[PDB]
């Protein structure tokens, strides 16, 4: 399994046309707000 | 690093804006003589640099 190549399916927005959005910033799913740590509610934006 | 390019009295002005991607750059210059704000007139500014740099900016300092 090639797990080098990543794409986001999380983000709060869609994106702009033409658009190459490199954020790594934690995705907030729930309410309470993620301080930079993963976990419930709170997951990586990239998947392998 | 994706790009690298090297090429009062007067009056510079420039238009900054970046639409799609697309950073497009107005200027024009004259000579003047006021020292207290921008003399009235009217002129026009022409584009220059057109530079895809596909970077978000929300904000701008100045250097001197
Ligand atoms: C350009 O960057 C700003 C941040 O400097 C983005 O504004 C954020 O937008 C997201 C939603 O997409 C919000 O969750 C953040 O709270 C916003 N932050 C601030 C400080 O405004 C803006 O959306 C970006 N625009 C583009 C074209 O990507």
Redesign the pocket.
Same mark, same amino acid.
């Given at each position: 399994g090639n797990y080098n190549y990543l794409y986001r399916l999380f983000? #709060?927005?869609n994106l #702009?046309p033409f658009?190459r959005?490199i954020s790594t910033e934690i995705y907030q799913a729930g309410s309470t707000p993620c301080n930079g740590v993963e976990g419930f509610n709170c997951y990586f934006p990239l998947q392998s | 690093c994706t790009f690298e390019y090297v090429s009062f009295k007067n009056l510079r002005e420039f238009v900054f804006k970046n639409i799609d991607g697309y950073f497009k750059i107005y200027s024009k210059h004259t000579p003047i003589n006021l020292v207290r704000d921008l003399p009235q007139g009217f002129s026009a500014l022409e584009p220059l640099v057109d530079l895809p740099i596909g970077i978000?900016?929300?904000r701008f300092q100045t250097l001197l």
């Open positions: 983000r #709060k927005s #702009k658009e959005d | 978000n900016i929300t």
